[PDB]
Amino acid sequence: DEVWVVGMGIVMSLIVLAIVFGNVLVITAIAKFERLQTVTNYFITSLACADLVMGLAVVPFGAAHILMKMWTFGNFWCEFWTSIDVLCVTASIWTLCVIAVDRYFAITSPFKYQSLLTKNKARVIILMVWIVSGLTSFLPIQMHWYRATHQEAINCYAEETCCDFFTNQAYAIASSIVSFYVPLVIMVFVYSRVFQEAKRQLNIFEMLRIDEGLRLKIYKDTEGYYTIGIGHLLTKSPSLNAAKSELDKAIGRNTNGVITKDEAEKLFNQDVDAAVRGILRNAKLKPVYDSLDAVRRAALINMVFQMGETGVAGFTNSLRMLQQKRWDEAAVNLAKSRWYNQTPNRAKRVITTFRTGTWDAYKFCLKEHKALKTLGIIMGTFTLCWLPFFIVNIVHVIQDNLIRKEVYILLNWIGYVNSGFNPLIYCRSPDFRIAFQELLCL
Ligand SMILES: CC(C)CCC[C@@H](C)[C@H]1CC[C@H]2[C@@H]3CC=C4C[C@@H](O)CC[C@]4(C)[C@H]3CC[C@]12C
Numbered sequence: 001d002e003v004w005v006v007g008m009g010i011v012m013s014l015i016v017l018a019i020v021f022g023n024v025l026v027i028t029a030i031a032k033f034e035r036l037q038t039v040t041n042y043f044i045t046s047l048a049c050a051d052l053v054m055g056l057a058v059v060p061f062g063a064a065h066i067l068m069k070m071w072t073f074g075n076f077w078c079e080f081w082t083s084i085d086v087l088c089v090t091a092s093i094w095t096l097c098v099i100a101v102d103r104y105f106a107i108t109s110p111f112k113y114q115s116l117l118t119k120n121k122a123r124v125i126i127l128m129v130w131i132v133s134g135l136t137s138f139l140p141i142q143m144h145w146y147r148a149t150h151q152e153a154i155n156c157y158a159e160e161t162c163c164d165f166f167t168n169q170a171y172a173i174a175s176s177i178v179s180f181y182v183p184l185v186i187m188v189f190v191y192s193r194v195f196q197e198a199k200r201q202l203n204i205f206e207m208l209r210i211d212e213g214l215r216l217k218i219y220k221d222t223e224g225y226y227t228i229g230i231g232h233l234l235t236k237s238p239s240l241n242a243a244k245s246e247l248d249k250a251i252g253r254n255t256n257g258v259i260t261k262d263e264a265e266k267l268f269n270q271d272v273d274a275a276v277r278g279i280l281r282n283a284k285l286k287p288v289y290d291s292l293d294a295v296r297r298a299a300l301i302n303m304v305f306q307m308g309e310t311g312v313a314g315f316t317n318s319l320r321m322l323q324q325k326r327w328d329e330a331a332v333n334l335a336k337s338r339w340y341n342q343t344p345n346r347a348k349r350v351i352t353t354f355r356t357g358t359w360d361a362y363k364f365c366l367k368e369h370k371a372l373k374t375l376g377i378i379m380g381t382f383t384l385c386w387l388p389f390f391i392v393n394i395v396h397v398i399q400d401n402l403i404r405k406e407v408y409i410l411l412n413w414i415g416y417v418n419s420g421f422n423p424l425i426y427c428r429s430p431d432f433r434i435a436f437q438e439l440l441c442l
């Protein structure tokens with residue numbers, strides 16, 4: 001009825017507007033801020049382009065097809081529109097598969113979080129995805145290879161006002177597997193390894209980068225002591241000059257209370273090295289360290305880094321039970337300390353690491369790991385929005401009379417609405433957040 005059509009009209013207009021605004025913003029943000037011109041964001045540009053082309057050239061014509069209950073745009077635009085629709089989905093899922101693979105080679109390289117690809121190579125990859133997926137999208141449609149031979153389909157082909165996507169089973173099966181299932185299966189398989197590797201490759205340096213933070217200017221501790229870099233304690237003296245001298249001495253140049261990322265990592269290495277040397281020189285800590293596994297050793301190094309060899313050595317009953325592998329018993333004693341009261345968020349992560357012997361407490365804490373999670377969210381949400389439609393479509397092939405037109409259209413629009421979601425997910429990135437407020441003049 002009238003109220004449903006007008007109400008449907010408003011909702012669809014907002015979907016078209018949300019997709020277009022959101023995706024133009026992404027493209028603009030990457031194009032204007034150099035810090036965002038990265039290989040990963042070049043693939044995100046490929047994905048935002050598909051979503052923009054979806055939002056501008058696909059969804060408005062689909063909306064008009066639903067509202068008008070017919071196709072008023074002619075047979076040529078009908079086949080062309082359908083081809084663009086398929087291209088936008090094929091290109092998107094292959095771009096996500098490329099991201100997964102790129103992230104895999106990155107995490108399994110000594111560079112860890114940087115692409116092994118150059119921007120030129122990445123551009124050529126994107127161009128290859130779009131050309132190939134465009135060839136597999138447009139050719140079977142223009143050539144009419146997709147066409148079904150039943151009368152309901154045949155009548156619809158000859159009718160200029162009918163643009164119902166009737167396809168033969170071989171086309172529906174073949175194009176779905178190659179254009180959607182194969183890249184999806186590879187993406188989910190490869191990206192689960194990326195996540196596995198980020199947890200597996202967690203070390204003491206990332207653990208402390210997480211706990212201590214990074215500051216290139218002098219700041220105050222929890223104890224209010226002058227610090228810089230990754231928890232590098234400068235002096236217990238309440239003089240900023242005393243902190244500045246000690247800094248100038250450490251680095252070996254006129255720092256003026258500021259250091260480089262190169263200098264921050266340099267001090268950090270010495271500190272972590274000293275913590276380990278201090279453990280190996282302590283009679284009370286060395287047997288505890290020898291009995292611990294790789295992960296738990298990092299938790300112990302962390303404590304020595306924060307409190308010092310002597311401080312940790314005082315936890316005589318905890319250390320005894322760490323040695324005796326009585327983790328939950330050690331955890332209780334460690335919780336019943338001044339250390340836990342002073343730094344509860346850090347202590348709980350360290351205590352958890354001692355209990356589990358895993359990195360689950362440091363899961364998605366690093367900014368690079370947070371970027372990986374964001375990319376996983378993009379992939380997970382695309383899959384959730386498109387898979388019900390693709391399953392129902394390949395089930396309509398096996399069992400002809402499954403569910404009706406209204407369910408088929410609904411599930412396609414679930415997929416469509418995904419083109420509007422990605423700009424909101426990039427809001428997770430602080431770099432993207434700043435870019436947006438800058439472009440939106442907020
Ligand atoms: C209907 C069809 C033909 C239109 C498809 C639009 C085409 C022209 C778009 C979609 C995705 C686009 C690419 C998206 C990603 C990048 C990375 C960017 O840093 C340089 C350009 C480049 C390589 C774009 C070139 C143009 C491109 C291939």
Ligand SMILES: Cc1ccc(OC[C@@H](O)[C@H](C)NC(C)C)c2c1CCC2
Nearest residue numbers: 082085086089090165175176179412
């Ligand atoms: C290879 C491939 C790629 C994308 C697909 O769905 C997109 C879907 O919005 C369809 C085209 N829209 C109709 C409402 C026109 C499909 C295939 C195979 C059939 C379904």
